[PDB]
Design a protein around this ligand. Structure first.
Ligand SMILES: NC(=O)c1ccc[n+]([C@@H]2O[C@H](COP(=O)([O-])OP(=O)(O)OC[C@H]3O[C@@H](n4cnc5c(N)ncnc54)[C@H](O)[C@@H]3O)[C@@H](O)[C@H]2O)c1
Ligand SMILES: NC(=O)c1ccc[n+]([C@@H]2O[C@H](COP(=O)([O-])OP(=O)(O)OC[C@H]3O[C@@H](n4cnc5c(N)ncnc54)[C@H](O)[C@@H]3O)[C@@H](O)[C@H]2O)c1
Lengths: 330, 7, 330, 7
C-alpha cells in the first residue's frame, strides 16, 4: 500500500480512517526538511503538510516517488509550486474550509482595536481598580466610534469578501485594493475599489491584509509604505507574516504613527512577546496563528485533505484533483 | 496509530 | 445663578462651557450619598450623576431645592424614579448616545467567546510557545464555528436591536424575548420572537442580556434558570450586574454547564478578579463597565446631559425636557 | 475649574 506521509505533524486520527484501506499513513513530525526519514524521501507517493515547514526546489529534488502534496490549509507560499510542477509533483490546497473562521477572527481583531476589550481584560488581570467614571474613561482611553470609519482591505478574495460582508453592519465604509481581480466584484458586493496601494493606505482608518504571500508582495507594508498610512491608523494582519516588515511596524507603533496593531501571523513563527522586532511595542495584540481554527473547520479540512490524497492515489493526476494549484507548471 | 518516521 | 451639582464625579470640562452662563456648576465626587455637601442638599436645583451611586426615596427627601436629575447614561435603575416624581423631581436619561458602542462591545464579547482571541492573547502574555499545529489546536481548543448557532437576546430595545443587525452577517439565527414590546418588531427586522424566558434559554447557544434592570428582573439568570440553558451555552452580560446571580454562574462555569461567560457589568462594582463570587471561575472574560465608552460617545452624552439641564433651568419642567423618564409619577 | 464640594 503506497506510503503517504504527514511531514510536519504527529496526529493522523482524522486522515487514517479515510486512507487506511489504500495507503500506509505515516508521520515525520519534522520542523525542518533535514528531519525527514529517508524512507519518506525514497518511497512516499503522497505528502500532507501544514504551514510550519518550507519546501524549496532543492528539497523537492530529494523525493524519488512523490506525486502529490496536499497543503492542509489555504496558503501555499511555503512550497515552490513551480519547482514541484516541473518535477512531476502536483500541489493542492484546502481553499475554503476556514473562510468564515478567518473572517470572524479578523472582525474580532478590528473590534478588539476599536473597543479595547482585550487590553481592558489584561488591565483587570493586572489588578487595575476602575471605581469611578474618570477611571473608566482613563483605562478605556482610545476606544473609538466605528460608524463612518474606512476599512481598507488589501486582497479581496475569499477571506477579504467575508470580512466586507461582516463589516458593513458596523457602519464601516469598505474599500479594497486587489490588482489581480477583473472588473465587477466591487459592483456586485457594493463596496468601493481603489487601484493602487497608496490610495488604499491614504484613505483607510483601519487596514486589513487578506492577500496571499507571493513573489511580488514580500514586505508590502514596509518603512516607506507605512509612512503613507493615515496618522493613527490601525493595522490588522491575519494573512501572512512576510507581508509586514516588523521593524517598520515596531517603530510606527512606538512613535504613535499607528494607533494599534493586531497580528495573527508573524515573519518568524512561533511568535514570542520576549524576542524579535516587536519586543517592546505598545498597542499590540497578537494571537499564535489561530484565525483558521475551530473544532468544525479543522475536521472539515483534515477530511478534505485526506479525500484529496484518496483521489490522487485512485484517480488521475492532476484531473482527479479538486484543488490543484500548480496545473500551469505540472 | 500512524507509522512513526520521526527523527 | 442656580447651583447644579455633579454628584459622583470630578470632571466638569464638557458641561461647564454649556452651563457656565446660567448655573454655578459644582462637583461632590461622592461614592455614597452621605458624602454630599449639605450645600448641595440645601441649594442645588439640578443634579448630574453616573451609575456609581444610588438614590433611594430616603436620599431624595434630603434635597430641599432639587428639581431635575439627569443620568449621564441610559440606565436609571440606580434612582427611585417614583419617589423622585412624588417629590417634585424630574429624572432624565441620555438613551441613545452609546447604542452602537454597546452593540459593538457586545459583538466583540461574543466573538471573544467563539474565537478565543482574548484568552489566546493572555496565553501568549504568559509565555506559551505554540510552535506546532497540535499546539495550535491545543491552545485554541474550544473555538467554535458560528454559522448556524442561535443567539438569544433578552431585551430587544435599542442595544438589543443593534446587536441583531450586526449578528446576522456572521450566520447567527437571532431570537429574542421581550415581554413588554407590542407585536411587530420581529416581522420588521426579520428575527424570531419567543414568548417565555424558558423558550429563549432552551433554544439558545449564546445568550446575551439587553434589558433594563427593573423591579421584576433581579437575578433573572439564577440557579433555577441557568439549569434551563443549553449544556455548553455561552452567556454575555453587557446590561446590568443585578440581572445575573454570580454564585449560580460561578458554579455553572466550574462544572462546565456554561462553556464561557463575558461580563461588562457585575453585581458589585468595581469588579476584581481577586474577590467575590467569581473569584476562581474558569472561562470568564470581564471588562470594567466600558461597553458604552468611546471618545465620541462620551462627548455626545456629556453635551446631551448639559443641554438637558439647560432646558430644565430655562424652560418648563417637565415639558421642556427631551428624555424625562418619570412623567407618569411627576 | 468647577466648584469643589467634596468630602
Ligand atoms: N491567519 C490564518 O490562520 C489564515 C487562514 C486562512 C488564510 N490565510 C491567508 O490568507 C490569504 C488569503 O486567503 P484567501 O482564501 O482569501 O485567498 P484568495 O486567493 O481567495 O484571496 C487572495 C487574494 O489576494 C489577492 N492579492 C494577491 N496579491 C495581492 C497584492 N499584492 N495586493 C492585493 N491583493 C493581492 C489575490 O488577487 C486574491 O484575490 C491566504 O493565502 C493565506 O495565506 C490565513
Ligand atoms: N454596559 C454598559 O456600559 C451599558 C451601556 C448602555 C446600556 N446598558 C444597559 O442596557 C440596558 C438596555 O438598554 P437599551 O438602551 O437597549 O434600553 P431600552 O429601554 O431601549 O431596551 C430595554 C428593553 O428591555 C426590555 N425588557 C425589560 N424587562 C425585560 C425582561 N424582564 N425580559 C426581557 N426584556 C426585558 C424592555 O421592554 C426594553 O425593550 C439599559 O437599561 C442599561 O442598563 C449598559
Amino acid at each position: 500500500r503506497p506510503l503517504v506521509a504527514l511531514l510536519d505533524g504527529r496526529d493522523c486520527t482524522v486522515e487514517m480512517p479515510i486512507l487506511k484501506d489504500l495507503a500506509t499513513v505515516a508521520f515525520c513530525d519534522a520542523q525542518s526538511t533535514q528531519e525527514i526519514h529517508e524512507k519518506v524521501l525514497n518511497e512516499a507517493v503522497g505528502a500532507m503538510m501544514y504551514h510550519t515547514i518550507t519546501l524549496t526546489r532543492e528539497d523537492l529534488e530529494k523525493f524519488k516517488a512523490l506525486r502529490v502534496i496536499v497543503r492542509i490549509g489555504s496558503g501555499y507560499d511555503n512550497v515552490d509550486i513551480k519547482a514541484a510542477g516541473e518535477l512531476g509533483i502536483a500541489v493542492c490546497n484546502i481553499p475554503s474550509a476556514a473562510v468564515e473562521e478567518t473572517a470572524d477572527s479578523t472582525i474580532c481583531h478590528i473590534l478588539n482595536l476599536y473597543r479595547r476589550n482585550t487590553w481592558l481584560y489584561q488591565a483587570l488581570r493586572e489588578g487595575t481598580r476602575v471605581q469611578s467614571v474618570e477611571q473608566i474613561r482613563e483605562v478605556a482611553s482610545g476606544a473609538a466610534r466605528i460608524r463612518g470609519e474606512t476599512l481598507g482591505l488589501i486582497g479581496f478574495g475569499r477571506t477579504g469578501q467575508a470580512v466586507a460582508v461582516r463589516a458593513k453592519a458596523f457602519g464601516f465604509s469598505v474599500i479594497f485594493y486587489d490588482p489581480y481581480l477583473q472588473d465587477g466584484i466591487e459592483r456586485s458586493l457594493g463596496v468601493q475599489r481603489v487601484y493602487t496601494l497608496q490610495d488604499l493606505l491614504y484613505q483607510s482608518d483601519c487596514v486589513s491584509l487578506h492577500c496571499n504571500l507571493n513573489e511580488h508582495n514580500h514586505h508590502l507594508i514596509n518603512d516607506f509604505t507605512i509612512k503613507q498610512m493615515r496618522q493613527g491608523a490601525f493595522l490588522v494582519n491575519a494573512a501572512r507574516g512576510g507581508l509586514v516588515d516588523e521593524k517598520a511596524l515596531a517603530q510606527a507603533l512606538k512613535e504613535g504613527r499607528i494607533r494599534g496593531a493586531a497580528l495573527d501571523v508573524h515573519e518568524s513563527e512561533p511568535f514570542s512577546f520576549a524576542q524579535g522586532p516587536l519586543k517592546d511595542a505598545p498597542n499590540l495584540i497578537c494571537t499564535p496563528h489561530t484565525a483558521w481554527y475551530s473544532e468544525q473547520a479543522s475536521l472539515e479540512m483534515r477530511e478534505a485533505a485526506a479525500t484529496e490524497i484518496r483521489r490522487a492515489i485512485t484517480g488521475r493526476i492532476p484531473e482527479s484533483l479538486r484543488n490543484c494549484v500548480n496545473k500551469e507548471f505540472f | 496509530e500512524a507509522l512513526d518516521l520521526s527523527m
